[PDB]
C-alpha cells in the first residue's frame, strides 16, 4: 500500500492538498479536477494507498484499456474512475532528468517499478491517456523492502528517470509490481517539464 508521492500521483495530490478541506466549495474553481474526483468518490483520495489490481500476471497492457490507465483499469469497482477524466490537473515542476519517490507503508518490496512519461505532442488537457503515448524512461528491478529507505510509517525509494525533449505539461505513469502477492499499482502523476 503506497503511491508515488513526488511528483505526487493524482490521488495523492488531491488528498495532500485538499484532504484537510475536502468540502471547500472554492475547489470547484481552484482545482476542478480534484473537485470532480472528490464529488464522485472521496475514497479515491482517502484510499490513495490502494490503487491496485491483483492477478494481472504481468500483462498490464492487457488488463488496462486506453483511457483507463489512471484508474488502473477501473479497478476495485470503479473507486478511482474519476482519475481518468481529461482536464487541467494540477502539475508540479520537474526537469528532464528527474526522480520518482515511491512510498510504501507496508514494506512489500518490488519485483520491479517502471516509470513512463508521455511523448512530446501528447495533450493531457484534451486527450485520454493511451499506452502508445508513453515511453519507458526509468526502471528498477527486484528490490526487497530491506533495501528501501526507512521512513516514518513505511519505506521509500527513488527511481531515476530521463525524459529527453519534453517541455510543458506531461503525465508520468508509474507501475509498481509488489513482491508479496501478484498485486500491481498504477500511478499517474501530472508534471510540467518547464
Ligand atoms: Cu499493500
Descriptive notes:
The PDB classes it as carbohydrate. Keywords: Lytic polysaccharide monooxygenase (LPMO), carbohydrate. It is a single chain. The protein is α+β, with helices and mostly antiparallel strands and 194 residues long. Helices cover 18% and strands 34% of the residues. The longest helix has 9 residues, at 10-18. Residues 1, 106, 108 line the site of copper (II) ion (CU).
| The CATH architecture | Distorted Sandwich
Distance, first to last CA:
31 Å
Main sheet: strands, sense, barrel: 6 strands, mixed
- Please, how many helices? 6
User: What is the CATH fold-level name?
Assistant: Coagulation Factor XIII, Chain A, domain 1
Q: Give the strand content.
A: 25-35%
Report the order of strands and helices: EHHHHEHHEEEEEEEE
Give a brief description.
The chain is of the alpha+beta class.
Strands, helices and their partners?
Blueprint: E1 2-6, H1 10-18, H2 27-30, H3 32-40, H4 43-46, E2 52-54, H5 60-63, H6 75-78, E3 92-93, E4 97-104, E5 110-118, E6 134-140, E7 149-151, E8 154-162, E9 169-178, E10 183-192
Parallel strand pairs: 3-10
Antiparallel strand pairs: 1-4, 2-10, 4-8, 5-6, 5-9, 7-8, 9-10
The protein binds copper (II) ion.
Q: What would the keywords be for this entry?
A:
binds copper (II) ion, 6 helices, carbohydrate, alpha+beta, Coagulation Factor XIII, Chain A, domain 1, Lytic polysaccharide monooxygenase (LPMO), 4-stranded antiparallel beta sheet, 194 residues, monomeric, globular
Amino acid at each position: 500500500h503506497g503511491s508515488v508521492v513526488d511528483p505526487a500521483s493524482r490521488s495523492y495530490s488531491c488528498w495532500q492538498r485538499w484532504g484537510g478541506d475536502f468540502q471547500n466549495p472554492a475547489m470547484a474553481t481552484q482545482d476542478p479536477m480534484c473537485w470532480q474526483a472528490w464529488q464522485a468518490d472521496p475514497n479515491a483520495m482517502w484510499n490513495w494507498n490502494g490503487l491496485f489490481r491483483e492477478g494481472v500476471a504481468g500483462n498490464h497492457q492487457g488488463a488496462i484499456p486506453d483511457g483507463q490507465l489512471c484508474s488502473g483499469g477501473r479497478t476495485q469497482s470503479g473507486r478511482y474512475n474519476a482519475l481518468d477524466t481529461v482536464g487541467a490537473w494540477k502539475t508540479v515542476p520537474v526537469t528532464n532528468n528527474f526522480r520518482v519517490k515511491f512510498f510504501d507503508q507496508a514494506s512489500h518490496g518490488a519485483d520491479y517499478i517502471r516509470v513512463y512519461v508521455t511523448k512530446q505532442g501528447y495533450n493531457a488537457l484534451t486527450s485520454p491517456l493511451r499506452w502508445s503515448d508513453l515511453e519507458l524512461v526509468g526502471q528498477i528491478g527486484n528490490t526487497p523492502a530491506s533495501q528501501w529507505t526507512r521512513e516514518v510509517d513505511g519505506v521509500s525509494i527513488q527511481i531515476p528517470a530521463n525524459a529527453p525533449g519534453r517541455t510543458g505539461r506531461h503525465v508520468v505513469y508509474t507501475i509498481w509490481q509488489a513482491s508479496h502477492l501478484d498485486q500491481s499499482y498504477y500511478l499517474c502523476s501530472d508534471v510540467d517539464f518547464g
